[model samples]
Target chain A: NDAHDLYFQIKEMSENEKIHEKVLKAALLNRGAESVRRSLKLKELAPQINLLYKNGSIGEDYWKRFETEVKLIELEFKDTLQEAERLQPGWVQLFVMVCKEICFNQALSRRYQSILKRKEVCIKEWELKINNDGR
Target chain B: TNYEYDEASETWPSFILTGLLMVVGPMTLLQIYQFNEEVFKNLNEEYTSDEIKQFRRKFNIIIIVGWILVAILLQRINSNDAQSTSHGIALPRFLVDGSASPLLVVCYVALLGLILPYFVSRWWARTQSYTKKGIHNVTASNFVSNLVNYKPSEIVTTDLILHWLSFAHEFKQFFPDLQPTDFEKLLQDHINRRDSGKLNNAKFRIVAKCHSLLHGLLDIACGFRNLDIALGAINTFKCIVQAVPLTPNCQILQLPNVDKEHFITKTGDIHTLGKLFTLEDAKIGEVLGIKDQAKLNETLRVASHIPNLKIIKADFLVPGENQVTPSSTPYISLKVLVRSAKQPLIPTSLIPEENLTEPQDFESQRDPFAMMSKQPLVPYSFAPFFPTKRRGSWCCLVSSQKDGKILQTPIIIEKLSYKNLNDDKDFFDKRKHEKFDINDWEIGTIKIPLGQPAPETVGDFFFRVIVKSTDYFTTDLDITMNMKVRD
Candidate 1:
């Protein structure tokens, strides 16, 4: 029933091309569909920052200067904490905690893999919480 | 003629002839020398005449030249020297002489760089947190906690755990139900504080703390009351923990005691005694680098109370979430040693013994257990009584985790053992006598490290420890750890 309740929200998120279906399901089931759907600008900026880091847009010695950008991305996501947790109560506590931790990780290696794992956890958790809630 | 007294851009020779021959010149050099002399004066007890003299020679030059060099490199003390204020008043009288000269800038630089560092080193070890850099190295300067990895190795001690514990005296009151996680969180919050403007000393101080609500004991009571513990001393922060099936109906944790608060440790004939943390080389070097042999021993013995903690290394940091989270062996192995065994108070029960060690003795004797004294105030002596387990004991505890607001099924002891600590008499005699000492105590140690392979899970693994003995001669020890089993 909980998943059913979120079906339309999930469908609504799914309509947005930028939102991943799994994330859409997770966001909707977790009731954070609206919150997770809002950061297109940051999502768009992620690739640029990652590339800037790789292409030496800044020299190897100075790549850390981009820690600022990572911080900005993190800062934006940190606020969503209010929305995510409110929706599913910890829908993103662990996620936010880890992401905040990553900002300080400085040498953000395997960014894609690391971020993907966290996203998956969100989706998986959403699916599980829905199941457990008698949905 | 209003001010023909204005001398030509004064020639260097003339300025030196007049300034040096007259005043300020010698004073600058004297100030440089004076600052160092005071810093180095007290350490002779640590070194010999020859070593100290040699040290002084090396020091004098580094200090003296450092000041001179600082003045020269500044290139602009009074850059706006000749300029007037918007008021258009004659150049203020102070700048008239060479007072605003770069030489004076040298005074500021060297003192900030060399002279002031000595004072900072002494006070710096008191504050143990890290943060983003702002005007950090520039100026009264940075707060010092034993974990400040940057303070000159010569003057600072590197026992981060001890330094952190010292903070307990100050912040313990604020955090009534303090425990490792609260301490850990406090450490993280402060470490993340904005550190800069070296001139800002108070920013990194006694009051720069908050309640450790993250893993507060009251929340765990068994998890809560036991950490740092209950009144007049009913339970212990260290000891063994075991889970009970009770729910919202939480019970007041009561561990059978060597005393009121110092229990659990009271019964175990043997609990795994060990160094769950290791003193990494850098931290070791900072304190050991104190070259004065006599001073070294005395220094280590004098101020270093209740030894040290976590990560199993002498870290300059209290460590952050990142540092603790991901690690192949997140838990450093438990190097447990059976340093003390046998009912400490002798005859198994008698005279209501003591833990010696001076202040600890005084504190151990205090009744009504330690209260907030107003939720918190003072960093000098309010730290809740630490676990008094010395070594050679086996114990257990309930592994706790708070999920959302609900408490989950806790983890019970995975495995445990007692290892040899090579008993030393010094600890036995730390307080000399109150009938407290662990010399010639019975012992039997076994080894089975890390225990049966973790049944697949991702989490940090460690034991919260220490044990109290029948002997008044109590002591706290280590929490075993490491070998993180992650996916």
Candidate 2:
């Protein structure tokens, strides 16, 4: 599905009379999620997250929006594991926060480029999102 | 009191008596033997002379009184010995026996043998005074004659003979027992000295004769030619002779003076003799106090004065084209002319004050008229890279052909530098920064199909060009261009 999405996006880019950048952005968003899902099914979630972030698809905006959702999913997954029953919820919370921090760190790098380009408002907004997510 | 006085007087008399006994006992007897004949004559005839009467008086009293005292002292010592024996003091028998031993007799014999030779040689030397005179006079005369003559062979002989005779005399006087073989050795040494002297004399005479003959020939040659020119030629010839050995029988013949044109025309072999003669003449002018620049100008003028001297156009000729067989010369035509000046006329003018003193502030001092008159008509082609396929390969291949010709003569490199454009990307990236001007960068030509491998990197290429400059000096910018070959 991910490959199909990538191929379609590239084909559309090639054929479009006037290819919008928004359309490419939308394609990246869908492909990033599909790659994450596939990685979860294959039980290689960390590598999937890394690939999505490394390919520049999980950019500043995407990471800020998904940080809370990923933490919630991590919490629920740990709850489902019986072996993790002996571990405290705070430890699971800490592990979920670490994953969010890694994603946020990657988003911070993306936001830095925009800040260098003088997108001050966008940089401020990303900073606010990260602070709120950490709380 | 009387006993004390008597004892003191007796001690004095006894000491005098003993001293008289010691002197007259052995010495007088030895003198009687030494002058036995003289003493007998004196005993018979000298009794009337006052000096002889004094000697007779002293000698008679000393002999009579010394013998009587010695006999009394010996008798007193024998009585003392008898009293010591009666008192039971044992005398040592070894002392008595040692005086009569065979070892003592042997020691006496050996000492006599050792001293006898020296005494005999002393007697012989005194008796044969003629031998001493002969040796002294002969040696002194030979030394004086050798010094006066100053002949090396005679001096060597005289030195050897004097040394041998002196050594033999020392041995005979100090060691009279020296063997007959020692004297034979001295004789043989003298014979050898004579033989060597004769051989050396013969050799020296031959060498001296040869030296004189050669000197005479040189004098005759100088009489025919100018003295300065002859000396210059002789110096040049000496330098050449020292470099190589010549055959003993070979004679160096100076050619007779011929007209310059005739010599050049007759001798078709490269005309180096004309060059040598011109150089000799120039050297002679220098020796005669002509200024160096003036002499150089004169030499060039003489070279130009030669008839039928055509300017050979400078050309890149292929090997074997201009040989015996007539063929079209394969050379890029270049103009050549004799400009009777001290320095070659380079295309570019290099003013020392402008170039050396203030290089950074200096501008090229090229003549404005020359630059304006010869403005290049051809437009220069420029591209980021040369044409890829055909034109590029054409340059590479033709350069390889030129490389063969260029390699025949070494190409001189002038200056080299390299820049790493990739490493300092911001400096080279034209999109962000203004283009860097490289006008001061040097350009040079290198032969393709190089004798050695071409440099692999641009930096290596720059360094290789720098190293090649050590042996050659490039006058033309075209000759100094860096070569580029196709992959």
Kept native contacts, fraction for each prediction = 0.00, 0.00
Kindly report the interface RMSD of candidate 1, rounded to 1 decimal: 20.6
TM-score of every model?
A: 0.21, 0.13
Residue A3 in model 2: lDDT: 64
Q: lDDT per model, in order?
A: 0.31, 0.31
Clash count, predicted structure 2: 6
Could you tell me the interface RMSD of model 2? 59.2
> Chain B alone: TM-score in each candidate?
0.20, 0.15
Error of 1 at B91 (Å): 14
What C-alpha lDDT, on a 0 to 100 scale, does residue B354 get in candidate 2?
Answer: 31
- Give candidate 2 regions above 4 Å deviation: A1-135, B1-100, B122-138, B141-487
> Any residue pairs clashing in model 2, and if so which?
B444-B480, B444-B481, B444-B482, B445-B480, B445-B481, B445-B482
- Against the true structure, what is model 1's DockQ? 0.04
